[PDB]
Swiss-Prot record, chain A:
Transmembrane segments: 14-34
Keywords for the protein's UniProt record, in alphabetical order: Acetylation, Electron transport, Membrane, Mitochondrion, Mitochondrion inner membrane, Respiratory chain, Transmembrane, Transmembrane helix, Transport
Gene encoding the protein: NDUFA3
Organism, as annotated: Bos taurus (Bovine)
Annotated localization: Mitochondrion inner membrane
Protein name: NADH dehydrogenase [ubiquinone] 1 alpha subcomplex subunit 3
Quaternary structure annotation from Swiss-Prot or TrEMBL: Complex I is composed of 45 different subunits.
UniProtKB/Swiss-Prot annotation, chain B:
GO biological process entries: mitochondrial electron transport, NADH to ubiquinone; mitochondrial respiratory chain complex I assembly
Native organism: Bos taurus
UniProt name for this protein: NADH dehydrogenase [ubiquinone] iron-sulfur protein 8, mitochondrial
Family under the similarity heading: Belongs to the complex I 23 kDa subunit family.
Residues of the full protein shown: 37 to 95 of 212
Molecular function as annotated in GO: 4 iron, 4 sulfur cluster binding; metal ion binding; NADH dehydrogenase (ubiquinone) activity
Compartment list: Mitochondrion inner membrane
Amino acid sequence: VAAFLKNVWAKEPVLVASFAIAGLAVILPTLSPYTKYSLMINRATPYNYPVPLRDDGNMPDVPSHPQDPQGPSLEWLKRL
Amino acid sequence: TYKYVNLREPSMDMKSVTDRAAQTLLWTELIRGLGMTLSYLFREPATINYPFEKGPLSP
């Protein structure tokens, strides 16, 4: 079966190259950590309006000032 | 006498197939050969302007 890759690649060299692109395409999205950066950006794109809520006692976090360090940090991308 | 033309068995080894695989897949044939032998356009057109120019003859 070791020459089976060398008696068809010298016989029909078209679909042999297709199966190699069938390979190396399913496997790699589960491999490199550049994915889940695809997920963090695609969720952090603001379409709609972020409506604020009503305070009653608490206040667990996030006061009215927008430029305060009160929310998350997606600002790694601008530094990236 | 003889001559046996177009009578040659293939190579069939590890490396020489890569010369026959790059031929079909990436077309190192048909452009180096047939795109250069056409151009070859810069030669002078050998045309006789018949009402003015005339060709050779014999006595």
